[PDB]
Design an enzyme around this catalytic site. Structure first.
Site, PDB file in Angstrom:
ATOM      1  N   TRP A 190     -75.461   0.503   4.736  1.00 15.56           N
ATOM      2  CA  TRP A 190     -74.403  -0.017   3.875  1.00 15.56           C
ATOM      3  C   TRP A 190     -74.466  -1.531   3.965  1.00 15.56           C
ATOM      4  CZ3 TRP A 190     -68.461   1.295   4.788  1.00 15.56           C
ATOM      5  CH2 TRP A 190     -67.672   0.545   3.906  1.00 15.56           C
ATOM      6  N   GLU A 191     -74.874  -2.170   2.868  1.00 13.00           N
ATOM      7  CA  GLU A 191     -75.039  -3.608   2.791  1.00 13.00           C
ATOM      8  C   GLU A 191     -73.983  -4.186   1.833  1.00 13.00           C
ATOM      9  OE1 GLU A 191     -79.095  -4.849   2.332  1.00 13.00           O
ATOM     10  OE2 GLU A 191     -79.874  -3.247   3.557  1.00 13.00           O
TER      11      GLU A 191
END
Ligand SMILES: CC(=O)N[C@@H]1[C@@H](O)[C@H](O[C@@H]2O[C@H](CO)[C@@H](O[C@@H]3O[C@H](CO)[C@@H](O)[C@H](O)[C@H]3NC(C)=O)[C@H](O)[C@H]2NC(C)=O)[C@@H](CO)O[C@H]1O
EC number: 3.2.1.14
Length: 540
Positions: free
Chosen positions: A291-292
């Site tokens: 998750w960026e």
């Protein structure tokens, strides 16, 4: 007298427990998980009495039995375990049983139990290492690397890894949910096609052709049910049963859906789809969450919320609970990992000292610290430490590690990142004291595949000769190459800076090293990852 010896009829001998629809573009239709493969065999008897009972044996064990009513017969039955079987037809009467010669049948399943091991020689400069340090040695392989980069699963130096991460598994969703994909021609539409009929926030496969259908070494026959990257990874698992192969969900352009998972209705649907994905694709050993990034500052400037850190911790707890349940249902161990920003400001949006209890490994993305998105502030993109000309540099590997340790993260959880690529700039100018990083740039360096990014293979192959200066900064632990006449500057990892990272991991009792992306190495980077962590040369 006992019956005549039957002759097995010519016919299909290749069957599958998880069936793949060869004329489908929607993930819902592409794959059909059955409890067992439907198998069929026929036979003829050319000489003798046909007996009174016909049986189909697999490795001597009866899979089907029925009355023998004529000179030919057909049997349909189910086989619920993948593998290869010596199938025979026997005709029996009160005087004895007469068995045909054996015909091999193949029952495919997504653990790769039907596949020969994919055991390929090391290529380029890769040298063999034994995984005996007890440290993580990880790398990401990108699904789309099989096209222009021509880097396929048979080219992975798999014996030199403990963890192979597959980037990236998407989360279904159209407008507002995956808008970051619209920046890449055709990519948003390709996801909508894969997710047709599929609920938003369930996982899918972004490129089913690359993942499952493209012919590749070892999976080229038309009726091989699993081809592409997934077919080869299954065969790789047969060659390396201790290799952990993790699907990575998210990355730069497929992270937007995570920002909605404060809604537990959506988060529950997602976790359930991950469970289903792991039940469907049995060669995978867990899940990586890339998750960026929680809080935003990823690809989408309109996403990110102060709630995200709480969402991340809940998500890791619930994934862990799902995986623990799958583990005891299967007898397998499953891993939960995450790739995370290495910037202290980003790290402190999340309580990793809580989340770590759900996680096997934290992949600290100690790279991309600098790059062509900023033409004014130049610096080492993946250095261990600050350089001597700017000792207060915020974005270093040590600063990210220290931020996690300061929260209370156990050092053994932390896996330090190395880059198998450089970032850089063109037109660098106005610098002092022969340090190009103190200048400013006019644009990105010309890239191997895209602006501002250069495969390490190309740095080593082209940019360490001619006019290019080479400098190893021993304070930062960081190499760079600089072409004065055009102002091209490239910052990257090399064997020596990776060795500094490995020694640092061992000295601080961290968990190991990982890299992005495996296609871009010529072998020097992964060799140094292995050597610096103390893995012995040779084969196990
Ligand atoms: C982050 C992400 O989602 N992926 C991006 C990539 O998609 C992109 O690489 C390109 O991927 C597409 C497929 O997704 C490739 O298109 C394929 O092209 C071949 C012919 O070249 C064609 O036969 C395939 O069927 C076709 N598939 C589709 C669905 O279009 C394209 O060739 C890839 N290009 C490369 C890298 O060779 C990369 C670009 O580097 O960016 C990612 O961020």
């Amino acid at each position: 007298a006992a019956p005549g010896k039957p002759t097995i009829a010519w016919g299909n001998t290749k069957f599958a427990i998880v069936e793949v629809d060869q004329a489908a573009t929607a993930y819902n239709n592409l794959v059909k998980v059955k409890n067992a493969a439907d198998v069929s065999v026929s036979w003829n008897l050319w000489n003798g009495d046909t007996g009174t009972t016909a049986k189909v044996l697999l490795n001597g064990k009866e899979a089907w039995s029925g009355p023998s009513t004529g000179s030919s017969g057909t049997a349909n039955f189910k086989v619920n375990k993948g593998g290869r079987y010596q199938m025979q037809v026997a005709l029996c009467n009160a005087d004895g049983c007469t068995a045909s010669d054996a015909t091999e049948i193949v029952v495919a399943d997504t653990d790769g139990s039907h596949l020969a091991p994919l055991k390929e020689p090391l290529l380029e400069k890769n040298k063999p290492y034994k995984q005996n340090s007890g440290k993580v040695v990880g790398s990401y392989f990108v699904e789309w690397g099989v096209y222009g980069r021509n880097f396929t699963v048979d080219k992975i130096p798999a014996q030199n890894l403990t963890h192979l991460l597959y980037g990236f598994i998407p989360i279904c969703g159209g407008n507002g949910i995956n808008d970051s994909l619209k920046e890449i021609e055709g990519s948003f539409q390709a996801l909508q096609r894969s997710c047709q009929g599929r609920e938003d926030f369930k996982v899918s496969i972004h490129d089913p052709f690359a993942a499952l259908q493209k012919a590749q070494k070892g999976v080229t026959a038309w009726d091989d049910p699993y081809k592409g990257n997934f077919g080869q990874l299954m065969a790789l698992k047969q060659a390396h049963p201790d290799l952990k192969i993790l699907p990575s969900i998210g990355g730069w352009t497929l992270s937007d859906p995570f920002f909605f998972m404060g809604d537990k209705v959506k988060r529950d649907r997602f976790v359930g789809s991950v469970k289903e994905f792991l039940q469907t694709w049995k060669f995978f050993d867990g899940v990586d969450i890339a998750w960026e990034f929680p809080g935003g500052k990823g690809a989408n400037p309109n996403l990110g919320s102060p709630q995200d850190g709480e969402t991340y911790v809940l998500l890791m707890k619930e994934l862990r609970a799902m995986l623990d349940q799958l583990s005891v249902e299967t007898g397998r161990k499953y891993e939960l990992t995450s790739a995370i920003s290495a910037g202290k400001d980003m790290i402190d949006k999340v309580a990793y000292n809580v989340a770590q209890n759900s996680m096997d490994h934290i992949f600290l993305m100690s790279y991309d610290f600098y790059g062509a998105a900023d033409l004014k502030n130049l610096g080492h993109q993946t250095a261990l430490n600050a350089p001597a000309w700017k000792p207060d540099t915020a974005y270093t590997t040590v600063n990210g590690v220290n931020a996690l340790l300061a929260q209370g993260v156990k050092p053994g959880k932390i896996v330090v990142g190395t880059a198998m690529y450089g970032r850089g700039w063109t037109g660098v100018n106005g610098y002092q004291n022969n340090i190009p990083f103190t200048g400013t740039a006019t644009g990105p360096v010309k890239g191997t595949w895209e602006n501002g990014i250069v495969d390490y293979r190309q740095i080593a192959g082209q940019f360490m000769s001619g006019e290019w200066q080479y400098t190893y900064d021993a304070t930062a632990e960081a190499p760079y190459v600089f072409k004065p006449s055009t102002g091209d500057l490239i910052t990257f990892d090399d064997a020596r800076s990776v060795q500094a990272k490995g020694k640092y991991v061992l000295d601080k009792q961290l968990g190991g090293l990982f890299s992005a992306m495996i296609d871009a190495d010529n072998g020097d980077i992964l060799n140094s990852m292995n050597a610096s962590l103390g893995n012995s040369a040779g084969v196990q």
